[PDB]
Amino acid sequence: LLTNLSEHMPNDTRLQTFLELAESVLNYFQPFLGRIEIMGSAKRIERVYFEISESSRTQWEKPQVKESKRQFIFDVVNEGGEKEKMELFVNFCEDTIFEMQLAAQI
């Protein structure tokens, strides 16, 4: 809520004081908080703040995931076909979710 208020309201000294009061909790909840912009609903850019688990972040840095990410990036920006770009990005997302689930069995 504090992040949403600070980003949506750029100029407010009261919110600034609240931020200088809660900077510690903001720093703690920074690795867990995401930020994503979509076209979803209406015709404007929104923000989709959500939660990231510790396990998802600690399994993203596995060597298999890094190799798969490198291969996907190379194969999707080399040839591209820039609608299959988004299609294969979603497919790579699903495959990497499956690989994180598999790597959870450690």
Partner 1 sequence: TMSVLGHYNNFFFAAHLLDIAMGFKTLRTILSSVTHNGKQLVLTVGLLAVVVYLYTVVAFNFFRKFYNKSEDGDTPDMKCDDMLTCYMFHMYVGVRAGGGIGDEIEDPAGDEYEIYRIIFDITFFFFVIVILLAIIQGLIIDAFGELRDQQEQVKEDMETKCFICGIGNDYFDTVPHGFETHTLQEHNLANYLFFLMYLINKDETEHTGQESYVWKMYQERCWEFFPAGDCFRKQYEDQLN
Site string for partner 1, 17-56 (x = CB under 8 A): -----------------xxxxxxxx--xxxxx-xxxx--x
Shortest gap between Cβ of 25 and partner 1 (angstroms)? 18
Q: Which is nearer to partner 1, 22 or 85 (CB)?
A: 85
Q: Which residues of 6-37 are buried (b: 16+ CB within 10 A; e: fewer)?
A: beeeeeeeeeeeeeeeeeeeeeeeeeeeeeee
Give residue 61's Cα distance to chain centre: 14
CB 49 within 8 A of CB 34: yes
Greatest CA separation for the chain: 50
**Helix (H), strand (E) at residue 22:** helix 13-28
Contact with partner 1 (CB under 8 A) among 5, 22, 25, 86: 86
Contact with partner 1 (CB under 8 A) among 13, 24, 27, 78: 78
Q: Which is nearer to partner 1, 25 or 67 (CB)?
A: 67
Binding site for partner 1 (CB under 8 A): 10-11, 34-41, 44-48, 50-53, 56-57, 60, 69, 73-74, 77-78, 86-87, 89-90, 93-94, 96-97, 100
